[PDB]
Structures are given as structure tokens and as C-alpha cells.
Amino acid sequence: CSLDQTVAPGNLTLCGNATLFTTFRPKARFIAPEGWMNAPMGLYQRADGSIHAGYQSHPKHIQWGNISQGAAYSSDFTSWTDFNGSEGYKTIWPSQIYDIRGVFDGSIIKEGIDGYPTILYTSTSFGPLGATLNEAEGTETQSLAYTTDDGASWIKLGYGAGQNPVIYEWPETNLTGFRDPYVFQSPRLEALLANTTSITNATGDHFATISGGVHGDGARLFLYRQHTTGEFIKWTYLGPLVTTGYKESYGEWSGNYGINFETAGVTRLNPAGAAWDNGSDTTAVDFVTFGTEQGRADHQNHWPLWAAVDYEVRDNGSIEAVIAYSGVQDWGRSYAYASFPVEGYRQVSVGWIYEDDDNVILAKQFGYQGAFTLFRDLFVKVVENVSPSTPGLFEQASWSTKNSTDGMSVTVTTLGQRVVPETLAAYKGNSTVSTLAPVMLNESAAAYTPFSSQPTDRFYALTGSFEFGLNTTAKAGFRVLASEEEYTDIWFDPASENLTVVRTASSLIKSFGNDTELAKVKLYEIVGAESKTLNLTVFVDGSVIEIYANDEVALSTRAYPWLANSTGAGLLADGTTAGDVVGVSGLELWDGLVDAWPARPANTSQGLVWDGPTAAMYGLFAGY
Amino acid sequence: CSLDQTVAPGNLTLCGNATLFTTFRPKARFIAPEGWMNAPMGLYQRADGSIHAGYQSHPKHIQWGNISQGAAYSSDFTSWTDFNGSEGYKTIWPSQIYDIRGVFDGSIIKEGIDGYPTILYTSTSFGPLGATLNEAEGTETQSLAYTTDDGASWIKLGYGAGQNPVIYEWPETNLTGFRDPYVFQSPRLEALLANTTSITNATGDHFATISGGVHGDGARLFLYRQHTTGEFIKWTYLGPLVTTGYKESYGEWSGNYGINFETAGVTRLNPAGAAWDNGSDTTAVDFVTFGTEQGRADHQNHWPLWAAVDYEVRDNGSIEAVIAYSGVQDWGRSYAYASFPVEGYRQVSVGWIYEDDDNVILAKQFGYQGAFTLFRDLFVKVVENVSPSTPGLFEQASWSTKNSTDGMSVTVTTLGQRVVPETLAAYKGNSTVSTLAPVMLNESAAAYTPFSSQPTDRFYALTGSFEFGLNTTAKAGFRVLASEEEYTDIWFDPASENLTVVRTASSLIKSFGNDTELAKVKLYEIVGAESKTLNLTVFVDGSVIEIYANDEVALSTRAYPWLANSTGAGLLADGTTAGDVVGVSGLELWDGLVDAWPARPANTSQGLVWDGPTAAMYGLFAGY
Numbered sequence A, B: 001c002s003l004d005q006t007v008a009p010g011n012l013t014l015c016g017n018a019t020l021f022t023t024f025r026p027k028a029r030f031i032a033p034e035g036w037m038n039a040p041m042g043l044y045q046r047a048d049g050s051i052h053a054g055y056q057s058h059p060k061h062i063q064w065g066n067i068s069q070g071a072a073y074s075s076d077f078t079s080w081t082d083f084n085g086s087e088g089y090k091t092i093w094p095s096q097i098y099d100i101r102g103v104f105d106g107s108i109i110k111e112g113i114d115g116y117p118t119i120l121y122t123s124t125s126f127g128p129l130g131a132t133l134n135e136a137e138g139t140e141t142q143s144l145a146y147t148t149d150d151g152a153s154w155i156k157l158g159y160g161a162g163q164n165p166v167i168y169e170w171p172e173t174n175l176t177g178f179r180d181p182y183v184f185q186s187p188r189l190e191a192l193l194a195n196t197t198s199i200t201n202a203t204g205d206h207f208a209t210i211s212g213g214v215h216g217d218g219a220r221l222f223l224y225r226q227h228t229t230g231e232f233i234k235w236t237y238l239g240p241l242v243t244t245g246y247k248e249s250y251g252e253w254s255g256n257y258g259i260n261f262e263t264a265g266v267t268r269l270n271p272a273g274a275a276w277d278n279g280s281d282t283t284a285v286d287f288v289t290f291g292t293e294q295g296r297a298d299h300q301n302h303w304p305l306w307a308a309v310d311y312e313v314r315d316n317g318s319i320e321a322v323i324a325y326s327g328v329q330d331w332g333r334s335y336a337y338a339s340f341p342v343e344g345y346r347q348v349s350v351g352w353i354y355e356d357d358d359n360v361i362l363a364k365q366f367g368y369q370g371a372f373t374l375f376r377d378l379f380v381k382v383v384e385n386v387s388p389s390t391p392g393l394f395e396q397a398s399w400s401t402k403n404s405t406d407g408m409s410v411t412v413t414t415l416g417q418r419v420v421p422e423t424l425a426a427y428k429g430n431s432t433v434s435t436l437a438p439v440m441l442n443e444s445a446a447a448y449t450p451f452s453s454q455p456t457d458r459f460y461a462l463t464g465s466f467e468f469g470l471n472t473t474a475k476a477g478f479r480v481l482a483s484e485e486e487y488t489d490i491w492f493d494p495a496s497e498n499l500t501v502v503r504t505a506s507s508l509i510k511s512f513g514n515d516t517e518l519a520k521v522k523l524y525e526i527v528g529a530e531s532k533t534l535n536l537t538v539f540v541d542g543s544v545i546e547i548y549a550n551d552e553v554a555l556s557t558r559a560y561p562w563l564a565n566s567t568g569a570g571l572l573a574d575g576t577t578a579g580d581v582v583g584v585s586g587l588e589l590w591d592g593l594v595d596a597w598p599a600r601p602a603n604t605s606q607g608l609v610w611d612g613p614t615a616a617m618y619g620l621f622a623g624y
């Protein structure tokens, strides 16, 4: 095993465990110290204002198993500190018959058991578990634990009648899944249900959704309500909140609803952020965010989606969330988005970016798998004075339109996402910032034009505003992690409305994924404008490439170039001419970003272990 | 619910939990503080000379489940103190994927991991588990834990490759069971295998048996040897030690070998007690003790047996224990005998006495189930100068015979059992002792003759020597727990060789078992004697009646008389005449015995709990 990054890569499968630990590793974002991670969980803002972030964790392994909550905290979403207790950075782990198969995703009741922060989580036990298997009742249940030390440790309720697990009966037969409880308060839902509480007797101030579906008949999001305020044992099933069809698709802008939901949550937003009104705010919109499985040919069969919904009250005292429009939270290699409330009327969302090594060829050599996305403020994105001649505008696919009284302009509403300002400020302030001169891309434009200032490593951010003609057929964008022989191309093609990440040359190492990523982006044309603009921001962080367009479209992906000098970046141009010109302005490079884990050494591997021959006997975990 | 024991019992099923806690409860023996107990486990003499006793335990329940090690200690086998830690009186419990279904029986390596006492135990996980089910590999494995605080707590080895569980591969396919590891040192077996260690490479000083069987083909005791001295991870399977047939019986004196062995152990004894010679002691005999299941129509389908064995060395470096003669360790409601070494060349055996409420009618009202037997010294019982005209003597069923050179007398050898002297001394010294005049039972004998001194409660011991004519047809014995309306009759009938416990009148409460207990007892007639003698000792301890004959035959059973005055005792006589006389001598009553748990209050119930609806979902434990 040679680690010489000045020559072509050898057979890297001969390299030892964690020998490639630092080679491709993000430095500027949330990531476990080592080993396997997946979904964010247990997210909450603590009493001191800091953020507690949990994650699905399997230390010293590079595949999923014995799944536990790893945890850390931060005052600014950006610089983090690991918890360190008797189980290292874990704070909840399988320990009881009801959760011994895995401590799955859960969410936080801020004022819970004895007034303490309390997690409601999916406690798993034995038996077939999965949307494509014959799962039975009891395999997935929902259980409580609380913390008396602000997340350093959690105490589970006892096992038994009137204690854990607190939710165990399936609300309908033949479920594809029954997990990922999302607990939330909702003045909106309370107001809607207030006239029906005699029917159900459920009057608590917390609601919970559980994600699942029904075999052969599509996904379901089940709504429960806390039966009595201040009491956390009894949760009353109201009814299905979201019901979709077996592999139903709302269309090209909306992914596919698959067969089963995972990590679903419910929020209410207005243009500024989170909305906590009872329905009286006419600018507020109700949203559900949710993962779907088995409705996609690639990306691990997973779509991270969202929908704007209009609530209807059923005669039996339940709520139907009728989908008004439906979109995609991230178009790339991410999933398991969780959102949580943050002071100052914010709702913040974060997901998991998986690797692109699905055949598990170099995972042991990494010594870890997975990272988070950046933390994102959610809000209602409102675009005013939109031209009615914007192509495809009245499809109203993942947005709504409201015509002006005179019919000459439109107001567009959709889900907005932007990186939390704390992270952008910290990134910029710790980076070498190069403000770049604007560039007209015309007949003289090369295919690739390096920026006048270059990155010094694989940790940087770039932004630019690309102004296109209304009938352009030109393509433009950014090339990143670039040398002569390796590079990743991010293109926007206004004629097709497609944002693509072409990865055919991303790496000389042939075992990593190289499929082209694709997102749809609607450039809402403004009344009186003779052009249309794409604001494109890209974060490069080890192997992560995380792309944001117009505070709306997100696409996370992976690139693993071998060569030490595959760090460059610049502008891409295709079919730009004297007549079909792309004006690029607002160009800026941030080199360095932030060291997100200042207390960690460069190599936090503790080695990898094998569970031994019993892993295959039990049949629950891969064992490595 | 009336608790008036001066009148007939009402409907006691209306009584609350643990309302009958003290009514029938043993006071003079080892018993858990409350709830369910079964098999003794983890038995060892600690460095300070005290005895550590573990037991299969399910606190706050009255059926088996979440099975754990409860523990206590004693300096004299007789007066005990509970451990008290974070889990009350438990010291090992289900906590890992490999043992979450139950911490089953295990035994002690005195100088184990890092020099500490170490338990090798059956760690159970999910799946069908049982001799009549389709069990698979992995459901029962064997794991290690060690104690740094003399049994107050145990630390398990980690889960994984080269750690726990340490034995997981089935030695043969289609096992009926794979549990109850019994670890022991054996100069005998080491000497026998010393010439074959090149074949197996197993040279350690500890052996371990694992109890089981093969579907359709009878029970098996599998022999392992520690691969290397001072190392405890690697155990090498040598071969089957004991192989018996599907429901094979050695005869009327030997129970039935059933389909599967449980709690089997291996020892070597001589007339004084334990023998640690390499084979050079010609007075020493190798014994296996073992439970069998599904070879009995009653007594929970369970026989606690023993066999004298002659070891043969196989060509593959394993040992065949060929059964020379075969007997019964206890003929009544006991099972799960464990034996362990005690200083002064002793091997001490103790079992579990279950209740006689198999339909679980009053178990909740008790608030507990089960107790131990008394602790018993094992030894080789040798009877000299036996008359060749002793009926059935040369059947050599559960004994061996050696003729004198002249053929006129025989030496009989069998397994001896007697209550440990520490317990007899403590019992006698703390009791009101009445030494009773001898009684000739003849034509004037009533059916029942009360002793001249009577017990004052349900805690007493009695002994007597019954001298019978060689051709008697008379029966005699003891009546205990007796009033006019309730009593339990213990009869010996020399003509049939049957010791019986008739329980048709044991209690006015009709839900308890009332079947007649039966043991075979061989009165070895002595050359020149014109009579034959039965030495019969009976311990009455709450509901336990524990009977010993001739330091050889043991029979444990249960009686639950309701009336407060059903405590009396005396002599039984049937068919005694002027000519057929039974001389009773050496009569003595010990009233009171010992308070075995002096620190415990009278009622140590902590209430009972229900596991809730998930118990049936998981399908592992009854849930109460």
C-alpha cells in the first residue's frame, strides 16, 4: 500500500484499516470521530442556547449495526465538542429486550419526564425488520428516556406495563415500517382539533408522527397526540396524516413517494422562518419533510422529500394533510433529514450524506462512513413579480402561484433552504477570502477557466451569480477538486432546467460512484427582466460537494480524487458565443473554512473490529 | 380474601399479590428474597472460606423470564446474606445481544481472567429454544465474566471476535440443547489424555462439559478442554462424554435418560468425599450428575440423575464415559443439581425444589416460587459385609457389588449423599431438641401415634431408625404437618422396597399437587443380621418436606396445609402385629431449626409486575 498522491493510485484495497482516514475526510462539518454514522437524531437547543446533535452511530465498524446515539454539542452549529462518558461518545445504546436490536431515530420533548429533556425513540427488538420483509408487531416500538445532565447521559423508563415501550400497538395491519417518532408542539393542530377532543379524549400539547406504510398500498405518516398535558406514557393514535400511493410520483420536480416513509417531520413556516401561529398568519405554510424508500433506481433507493400541506379535520377527530405541492429537500447522496426549533423563530434542518462506495470496497481503509450536511434554516421562499411567461410556471409542481389582480404578474411560494448564518460567518471569517472580478463568458471562453485565486486544499466554498439570456442554450457552472487528470463539473443548463454534477473524471480510483447527479431548478423570471439568474454556492469539504441554488435547491454528493493537486476550481462554459453570453458576477472564494472539531486530533480512528461468527448466526448486523 | 387459618380456606384466588407470602414459606434454607427462582448457579468457595451461591432469578415475577443470577453468601451453608448492589440482589443480568434472552446456568473458574473468579455461563439470544423445538446455532452460546469484588459484581468480556461469546459453534448438528457449562479441573482426565495431546493440541488444566442432545437420538454431554493453561478464550471440543438413547432407561432404580441433558456436572469421589487423584486411588469412583427432560410423565418431565462411569480414551484424543451403574439424585420435586468443591476434600451438591402449583393458581398470592434443597456432601457410600441373600442385590442397578474371596459376603458401592454437617449442627443447636423413647410397633400400634413432644410450627426435623424383620410385610414411617384434617404420610414398605409420600390429605386447598411421591430404597442386609434397618430423616420447612434415607436416598416434596395447627408429627404403622413388629429407635425431634436469612424481614415482597402487551409480542417470557 502506497499513499503517494503524486502518482496514480495503486491497489488501495491492500491498504490497512483506517490508512486512508484523513485522505478524503471532511474537516468543516459535523461527522462522528470514527466508524459508521447515519441519521441525525435527538436534535434540540439546550437551555444554555447550545445545540445538542445526536446521530445513529456504530463505532469501530464501517457498516450499520448495534445502532446507538452518538452525540456532540455546539454554540454556533459550526464548531463542535464530543460528549465523553463511559461509552465514549455514545449516550444511548441497545441495552434492554425492547431496544437490543438498535436504538433507532428519535426526537426531543424539551419539557418532558420530571421537566427534563426527553427523547422518544424507536426501540427495536428481534424479527424481520424492513419495508420489503414480513415485519411483525413488537419488532419496532417507541420508548422514552430523559437526561438530567443536558445530554451527557440518558435514563430509560423501566421495561413493562405502563412504562417502556410506550407505543407498541400497530395502528393498522401489515405495516412496512413503524419508526422515527417526531414529537412537536403545534398551536395550529391544537386549534384544528379543539372542537373534536370529546371524540378522542386526547388533549395534550405534544403531537407525534410515526413513519411507515402498508404493504402493497404505499407510505403512511401516522399522527398521535399526547393524551394528557404533562404526562408522557399515553399517546393516542388519531389517524393517518399523510397517505400516498405505492410508488406514486407527483412528477419530475417531486421525486417518488416509494413504499414506506422514514424520518418524517412536521413543521410550519413563514417567510422569516418558523411560524407558531394557530392558523391566523396568512403568510404561514404547513410542511411535512420525509424520506421515501424503494421509489428510486439509485441513491440507495432513497428520496428526501418535502410537501406543503393543507390540513383537514376528519369526523373522528384526526387530521388529513392534503398535499398542495411537493418537492425535494436534496437531490444527491443525502437522506434522513431532521428539523428542530431554534430560538428567534427558526426551524433548522440537517441530514446525512452517505459515501459513494456502495460495494464497500474502501470503507475499511477509510475507517469511517458518513457525515452530516450543513445545518439549514427553513423558511417560506416568496418570489414577487414573477413573469407569467416563465416556462412551466403554472404546472405549480413544487411551488404555488398566486396571480396579481390584473394577471400581469405572479407571486411564487415554495420551501426555502439556506445554510445557517452562523456557519457562513464562521467559514468566511476563518478563510482566506478572494473576491473575484466578474467574468463574461462568450466566444472567447475556454471550456474551463481557473479562478484568479486558487484553493490550497480540499476545504473551500465558492459562490457566483450566473446571468443567462431568456432563450439561452448555453451551459455554465463550476469545476471543483480539479487537476488536469481529475475534476468534478457542476453545470447548469437553463434550456433543460437541469443542474448536473458530472463525475466521470472525479477520481482515478475506479471503485467510487461516478454517476451524474441531477437536480431541477426553476429560474423564476422577473417582470421586465431581459435575463434570468442562477445564484450557485458550492461547499467542498474533503469528499463532500454540497451545492445550493437560489436558497432553494440543494444537492449533496461525493468526489474522491487521488492526486494531492486535485484541489483547483473555476468556471465552466459550454456553447457560450458572442450572441449567447453568460455574465458571471458576485464571484468569491473562501479558502480553508473552519476546523469543526478543534479538540480532535487529525486521526481519531480507534481501529476496526469484527463481531465474529455470531454476527451471521444472529443475522441482525453485518458484523464489521 | 380471608387469611383465617382456624377455619376452612375460602377462595384464595381472590387474595391479592403476596398476601400468602409467609403462609407456606421456608425459613431454614436458601431461597430468593421474592419472586421466581430456579437452578443454582455460580457456586464456589471464596478466598475467605465463605460460600458464594448464585441462582436463576426473576424478581417481581412468579414465572421464569429475563433470567438472571441472584446471589448470596454464607460462612456455614446455613445462615445467608444477600448481595445488594445497583440491581438489588442480582449480580448478572441480560445486557448484550448474545445474552439478552437470558443469563442461563454457569459455573466457576476459581483462578480465571486476570487471576479472578470467572463464570462461564450460557448466554442466550433470540430464536426457538428448547429440546422439542427447532433450535438453531447461536441461540445458546457460552460466555465469560469475572469478578474483582468477590461476587458483588461481574464484568463480562466484550462482544466480538476473540471475545464473548467464547463457545458458539455446535459440535454436532440438530442439537436439542447446548447449555449449562460445567468447568472443572481433573488430574484423572489429564492423566488419561496426556498421551493424545498431539492429536488435539488441547493441554489446559480446565475441562468443561456442555449439556444437550441430538434430535431423535437421545441426550449428550459434550466434553471440551481449555486449549492452553492460563488462557480462557479458546476451548477445544474433544467429543461426547456421555451418550444415551432416546428415552432410554437403565431400569426401575435409574429413572429415564429422556431426550436432552440439563445442568450436568462431573466429579470424582472416594469414601471420605472428593477425590483429586489421577486414577491411583482404587477407592475413588468417577461420577456424572445430570438432569434429563421428556423422559417422565410428571415432575415437570424432569429426572435429576447420576451415574458412576468408567472412562475410556478414544483414538481421536477424547473420552467416553461408559456408564457402570446409574441412579437418582432426588426422587421428588427437585431438579438442576449443581456440585462444587469445598476445602477439606469435599464435593457439595445442591438443587432446586419447585412448588407444586403447576397450573399457577396461587403463585401470585405467594409472591414467590422455588427454593433450594439443603446442601449435601457427596461421597462414595460403601456397605461392607452385605448378605448375598439381600433381594435383588446382583441386579447392580444403582450400585456395584464385589464378592468376598469366599463368596459369603459382598461389598456394596453407591453414591452417598448427606446433609452438610454445618447445617445439622446449626439446626440442632438452635432447635428445641426432644430425644424420644424407642417405640415398638406391634398389634397395639395405632395407624398414627403422635410423638411425645410436638413441633410448635412448620420448621422442624425428625429422625428415626426403623428395624424390620427380613420377611416383613409391615409398613412404617412418619406423619408430618399433621392435624386431624390435614397431614402428609411418609411410608416405607420393605416388601415392595418403596418409600412413598402420600399427599391425598396434605391440604384442604385443592389446587396444589396431591400425587404420591415414590422412591426405591435398597435395604442392604448385613451378614448375620436377623433384621434390616431404615434410617429415615425428615426436614419440614414451611412447605418443603425433604427426606433422606440411609445417607443415600433423597426425596424432596411439597405440602401446603391451610390450618394453623397442621404442624404435628409422629409414627405411622400399617400391618404391624405381635409377630411382624417394627422397632423404632434413635428417635429425635428438632423444633425450630435456624433462621437462614437473619437480616431479612418476614415479608421481603416488593410487589409483582406485568411486562405488558410486548411480552406476547416478543414471545420469550410469560411476562408475569
Ligand SMILES: *[C@@H]1O[C@H](CO)[C@@H](O[C@@H]2O[C@H](CO)[C@@H](O[C@@H]3O[C@H](CO[C@H]4O[C@H](CO[C@H]5O[C@H](CO)[C@@H](O)[C@H](O)[C@@H]5O[C@H]5O[C@H](CO)[C@@H](O)[C@H](O)[C@@H]5O)[C@@H](O)[C@H](O[C@H]5O[C@H](CO)[C@@H](O)[C@H](O)[C@@H]5O)[C@@H]4O)[C@@H](O)[C@H](O[C@H]4O[C@H](CO)[C@@H](O)[C@H](O)[C@@H]4O[C@H]4O[C@H](CO)[C@@H](O)[C@H](O)[C@@H]4O[C@H]4O[C@H](CO)[C@@H](O)[C@H](O)[C@@H]4O)[C@@H]3O)[C@H](O)[C@H]2NC(C)=O)[C@H](O)[C@H]1NC(C)=O
Binding pocket: A092, A093, A095, A096, A097, A113, A114, A154, A155, A156, A157, A158, A159, A163, B066, B068, B085, B086, B087, B090, B093, B094, B095
Ligand atoms: C432484566 O433485568 C435487568 C436488570 O435488572 C433490567 O434492567 C433494569 O431495570 C430496572 C427497572 O426498570 C432499572 O432500574 C431503574 O434504574 C433507574 C436509574 O437508572 C440509571 O441508574 C442506574 C443505577 O446507577 C447506579 O449504579 C450504576 C452501576 O453501578 C452506576 O453507574 C451509577 O453511577 C449509579 O451508582 C450509584 O448508585 C448505586 C446504587 O444504585 C451505588 O452502588 C453506587 O455506589 C452509586 O452511588 C444505572 O444502572 C442505569 O444504567 C442502565 O440503564 C441505562 C439506561 O437507563 C443504560 O444506558 C446503562 O447501560 C444501564 O443499562 C441508569 O443509568 C431508576 O431511576 C429507576 O428508579 C425509578 O423507577 C421506579 C419505577 O419503575 C421506581 O420504583 C423508583 O422509585 C424510581 O422512580 C422515581 O424516581 C424517578 C426520578 O429519579 C421519577 O421519575 C419517578 O416518578 C419516581 O419518583 C419517586 O421518587 C421521587 C424522589 O423521591 C418523588 O419525588 C416521587 O414522588 C416518587 O415517589 C429504576 O430503579 C435498571 O436501571 C435496569 N438495569 C440495567 C442494567 O438495565 C431489565 O429491564 C430486565 N428486562 C426484562 C425484559 O425484564
Ligand SMILES: *[C@@H]1O[C@H](CO)[C@@H](O[C@@H]2O[C@H](CO)[C@@H](O[C@@H]3O[C@H](CO[C@H]4O[C@H](CO[C@H]5O[C@H](CO)[C@@H](O)[C@H](O)[C@@H]5O[C@H]5O[C@H](CO)[C@@H](O)[C@H](O)[C@@H]5O)[C@@H](O)[C@H](O[C@H]5O[C@H](CO)[C@@H](O)[C@H](O)[C@@H]5O)[C@@H]4O)[C@@H](O)[C@H](O[C@H]4O[C@H](CO)[C@@H](O)[C@H](O)[C@@H]4O[C@H]4O[C@H](CO)[C@@H](O)[C@H](O)[C@@H]4O[C@H]4O[C@H](CO)[C@@H](O)[C@H](O)[C@@H]4O)[C@@H]3O)[C@H](O)[C@H]2NC(C)=O)[C@H](O)[C@H]1NC(C)=O
Binding pocket: A066, A068, A085, A086, A087, A090, A093, A094, A095, B092, B093, B095, B096, B097, B113, B114, B154, B155, B156, B157, B158, B159, B163
Ligand atoms: C452495543 O453497544 C454497547 C455500548 O457501547 C456495547 O456494550 C459495551 O461494550 C464495551 C466493549 O466491550 C464495554 O466496554 C468494556 O467495559 C469494561 C468495564 O465494564 C464495566 O465497567 C463499565 C464502566 O464503568 C464505569 O461507568 C459506569 C457507568 O457510568 C459506572 O457504573 C462505573 O462505576 C464506572 O464509572 C467510572 O468510570 C467512568 C468512565 O468509564 C466515569 O464516568 C465514572 O465517573 C467512574 O469513574 C460499566 O459500564 C460496565 O457495565 C456494563 O456491563 C456489565 C457487564 O460487564 C453490566 O452488568 C452492566 O449492566 C453494564 O451493561 C461494567 O461494569 C472494560 O473492562 C473493558 O475494557 C477493556 O477491554 C478492552 C478489550 O475489549 C481493552 O481495550 C481495554 O484496555 C480493557 O482491557 C484491559 O483491562 C482488563 C482488566 O481491566 C484486562 O483483562 C485486559 O487484558 C486489558 O488489560 C490492559 O490494561 C492493563 C492495565 O493497564 C494492562 O496490565 C494490560 O497489559 C493491558 O494493556 C471495556 O471497556 C462496555 O462495558 C459495554 N457497555 C454496556 C453498557 O453494555 C455492546 O457490546 C454493543 N453490542 C454489539 C452487539 O456490538
Ligand SMILES: *[C@@H]1O[C@H](CO)[C@@H](O[C@@H]2O[C@H](CO)[C@@H](O[C@@H]3O[C@H](CO[C@H]4O[C@H](CO)[C@@H](O)[C@H](O[C@H]5O[C@H](CO)[C@@H](O)[C@H](O)[C@@H]5O)[C@@H]4O)[C@@H](O)[C@H](O[C@H]4O[C@H](CO)[C@@H](O)[C@H](O)[C@@H]4O[C@H]4O[C@H](CO)[C@@H](O)[C@H](O)[C@@H]4O)[C@@H]3O)[C@H](O)[C@H]2NC(C)=O)[C@H](O)[C@H]1NC(C)=O
Binding pocket: A161, A162, A163, B017, B364, B607, B608, B609, B610, B612, B613, B622, B624
Ligand atoms: C399484582 O401483580 C400483577 C403482576 O402479575 C400486577 O400487574 C398485572 O398483572 C396481570 C398479569 O398477572 C395483568 O393481567 C393481564 O392483563 C391483560 C389486560 O390488561 C389490560 O386491562 C387491565 C384491566 O383493566 C388493565 O389493568 C391493564 O392496564 C395496565 O397495562 C397497560 C398496558 O396494556 C398499562 O398502560 C396500564 O398503565 C396498566 O399498567 C391493561 O389495560 C390481559 O390481556 C391478560 O390476559 C390473560 O390473563 C388472564 C389470567 O391468566 C386470562 O383470564 C385471560 O384469558 C388471558 O390469558 C392469556 O393466557 C395466555 C398468555 O398467558 C394466552 O395464550 C391466552 O391467549 C390469553 O391471552 C392478563 O389478565 C394486569 O393487566 C396487570 N396490571 C397492571 C399492570 O396494572 C398487578 O398490578 C399487581 N397488583 C397490585 C395491586 O400491585
Ligand SMILES: *[C@@H]1O[C@H](CO)[C@@H](O[C@@H]2O[C@H](CO)[C@@H](O[C@@H]3O[C@H](CO[C@H]4O[C@H](CO)[C@@H](O)[C@H](O[C@H]5O[C@H](CO)[C@@H](O)[C@H](O)[C@@H]5O)[C@@H]4O)[C@@H](O)[C@H](O[C@H]4O[C@H](CO)[C@@H](O)[C@H](O)[C@@H]4O[C@H]4O[C@H](CO)[C@@H](O)[C@H](O)[C@@H]4O)[C@@H]3O)[C@H](O)[C@H]2NC(C)=O)[C@H](O)[C@H]1NC(C)=O
Binding pocket: A017, A364, A607, A608, A609, A610, A612, A613, A622, A624, B161, B162, B163
Ligand atoms: C481490520 O478491521 C477488521 C474489522 O473489519 C478486523 O477484524 C477482521 O475483520 C474481518 C471482516 O472485516 C474478518 O474477516 C472475516 O473473517 C472470517 C474468517 O475468520 C477466520 O479466519 C481469519 C483469517 O485467518 C482469522 O483472523 C479469524 O480469527 C479471528 O476471529 C476468531 C473468531 O472466528 C477469533 O477466535 C480470533 O481470535 C480472531 O479474532 C478467523 O479464525 C471470514 O469468514 C469472513 O468471510 C467473508 O468476507 C470476505 C470479504 O468480504 C469474503 O472474501 C468471503 O467470501 C466472506 O464473505 C461473506 O460475505 C457475506 C457476509 O458478509 C456472506 O453472505 C457470504 O456467504 C460470505 O461468508 C471475513 O473474511 C477478520 O476475521 C477479522 N480479523 C480478526 C478479528 O482478527 C481486523 O483485525 C483489523 N485489522 C487490524 C490489523 O487491526
Ligand SMILES: OC[C@H]1O[C@@](CO)(OC[C@@]2(O[C@H]3O[C@H](CO)[C@@H](O)[C@H](O)[C@H]3O)O[C@H](CO)[C@@H](O)[C@@H]2O)[C@@H](O)[C@@H]1O
Binding pocket: A038, A039, A056, A064, A067, A104, A105, A122, A129, A130, A131, A179, A180, A262, A263, A335, A336
Ligand atoms: O439507523 C436506523 C435509522 O435509519 C433509517 C433512515 O435511513 O433507516 C435506515 C435503515 O437502514 C440502515 O440499516 C441497514 C442494515 O440492513 C444498512 O444497510 C443501511 O445502510 C442503514 O441506513 O434501517 C432499517 C433497518 O436496517 C432499514 O430498513 C432502513 O433502510 C431510519 O428510518 C432509522 O431510524
Ligand SMILES: OC[C@H]1O[C@@](CO)(OC[C@@]2(O[C@H]3O[C@H](CO)[C@@H](O)[C@H](O)[C@H]3O)O[C@H](CO)[C@@H](O)[C@@H]2O)[C@@H](O)[C@@H]1O
Binding pocket: B038, B039, B056, B064, B067, B104, B105, B122, B129, B130, B131, B179, B180, B262, B263, B335, B336
Ligand atoms: O433458567 C434456565 C436454566 O434452567 C434449566 C434447568 O431446568 O433449564 C430450564 C428451562 O426451563 C425454564 O424456562 C421455562 C420457560 O418456558 C419455564 O417454564 C421453566 O419453569 C424454567 O425452569 O429453560 C429452557 C428455556 O425456557 C427450557 O427448555 C428448560 O426446560 C437449565 O438447563 C438452564 O440453564
Ligand SMILES: *[C@@H]1O[C@H](CO)[C@@H](O)[C@H](O)[C@H]1NC(C)=O
Binding pocket: A005, A006, A007, A483, A484, A485, A563, A565, A566
Ligand atoms: C498534478 O499532479 C500530477 C501528478 O503528480 C502531475 O502530472 C500534474 O502535472 C500536476 N500539476 C497540475 C495538474 O497542475
Ligand SMILES: *[C@@H]1O[C@H](CO)[C@@H](O)[C@H](O)[C@H]1NC(C)=O
Binding pocket: A134, A173, A174
Ligand atoms: C398481514 O397481516 C396479518 C396480521 O394482521 C398476518 O397474519 C399476515 O401474515 C400479514 N402478512 C401477509 C403477507 O399477509
Ligand SMILES: *[C@@H]1O[C@H](CO)[C@@H](O)[C@H](O)[C@H]1NC(C)=O
Binding pocket: A237, A238, A239, A240, A314, A316, A318
Ligand atoms: C379516523 O378516520 C380515518 C379515515 O377513515 C382512518 O384512517 C383512521 O384510522 C381513523 N382513526 C381511528 C380509527 O383512530
Ligand SMILES: *[C@@H]1O[C@H](CO)[C@@H](O)[C@H](O)[C@H]1NC(C)=O
Binding pocket: A388, A403, A407, A408
Ligand atoms: C393566472 O394568470 C395567467 C396569465 O395571466 C392566466 O393564464 C390564468 O388564467 C390566471 N389564473 C387565474 C386563476 O386567474
Ligand SMILES: *[C@@H]1O[C@H](CO)[C@@H](O)[C@H](O)[C@H]1NC(C)=O
Binding pocket: A076, A078, A079, A425, A426, A427, A428, A429, A430, A594
Ligand atoms: C472562526 O470560526 C469560529 C468557530 O465557528 C467562530 O466562532 C469565529 O467567529 C470564526 N472567526 C472569525 C469570524 O473571524
Ligand SMILES: *[C@@H]1O[C@H](CO)[C@@H](O)[C@H](O)[C@H]1NC(C)=O
Binding pocket: A252, A493, A496, A497, A498, A518, A520
Ligand atoms: C433534464 O432532466 C430530465 C430529468 O428530470 C431528463 O429527462 C432530461 O433528459 C434532461 N435533459 C437534458 C438535456 O439534460
Ligand SMILES: *[C@@H]1O[C@H](CO)[C@@H](O)[C@H](O)[C@H]1NC(C)=O
Binding pocket: B005, B006, B007, B483, B484, B485, B563, B565, B566
Ligand atoms: C385444629 O384446627 C381445627 C380448625 O380450627 C379444629 O377443628 C381442630 O379441632 C384443631 N385441633 C386439633 C387438630 O387438635
Ligand SMILES: *[C@@H]1O[C@H](CO)[C@@H](O)[C@H](O)[C@H]1NC(C)=O
Binding pocket: B134, B173, B174
Ligand atoms: C437439522 O439440521 C440442519 C442444519 O444442520 C437444518 O437445515 C435442519 O432444518 C435441521 N432440522 C431438521 C428438522 O432437519
Ligand SMILES: *[C@@H]1O[C@H](CO)[C@@H](O)[C@H](O)[C@H]1NC(C)=O
Binding pocket: B237, B238, B239, B240, B314, B316, B318
Ligand atoms: C471423536 O470421536 C468420537 C467417536 O467417533 C466422536 O463422537 C467425536 O465427535 C470425535 N471428536 C471430534 C471430531 O472432535
Ligand SMILES: *[C@@H]1O[C@H](CO)[C@@H](O)[C@H](O)[C@H]1NC(C)=O
Binding pocket: B388, B403, B407, B408
Ligand atoms: C458372587 O457371589 C454370589 C453368591 O455367593 C455368586 O452367586 C456369584 O456367582 C458370585 N460372583 C462371582 C463373580 O464370583
